[PDB]
């Protein structure tokens, strides 16, 4: 189906997903923040801060809170992350 990915503090885009988060994470980021993203990882809102997101598990691990379909995700570089203000603002509610 369609998935949403947001990366960096203010870099937001929405792309279809269904073949693991790797393509979504790697290609999403390539056009979105940088390029050659598979290094990268995705993170989603949990309690106080952002939770780490892996491969296919990433939707279920972060979204575990029980949400409809997959969307509110954030792209972050593997070498060294930093994003978080994304799932935080304009996402805290129920997007």
UniProtKB/Swiss-Prot annotation:
Please state where this protein is localized: Cytoplasm; Cell membrane
Q: Its biological function?
A: Serine/threonine protein kinase involved in conjugation and sporulation. It is thought that it phosphorylates the byr1 protein kinase which itself phosphorylate the spk1 kinase.
Subunit-structure text? Interacts with rad24 and rad25; these prevent its translocation to the cell membrane during nitrogen starvation.
The UniProt family comment states:
Belongs to the protein kinase superfamily. STE Ser/Thr protein kinase family. MAP kinase kinase kinase subfamily.
> Would you tell me the protein name for this molecule?
Protein kinase byr2
Q: Which gene encodes it?
A: byr2
Q: Which stretch of the intact protein is present?
A: 71 to 165 of 659
């Amino acid at each position: 189906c369609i998935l949403r990915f947001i990366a960096c503090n203010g870099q937001t885009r929405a792309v279809q997903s269904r073949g693991d988060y790797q393509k979504t994470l790697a290609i999403a980021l390539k056009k979105f923040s940088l390029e050659d993203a598979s290094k990268f990882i995705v993170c989603v809102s949990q309690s106080s801060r952002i939770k780490l997101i892996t491969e296919e598990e990433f939707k279920q691990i972060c979204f575990n809170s029980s949400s409809p379909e997959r969307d509110r995700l954030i792209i972050v570089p593997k070498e060294k992350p930093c994003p978080s203000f994304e799932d935080l603002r304009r996402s805290w509610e129920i997007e």
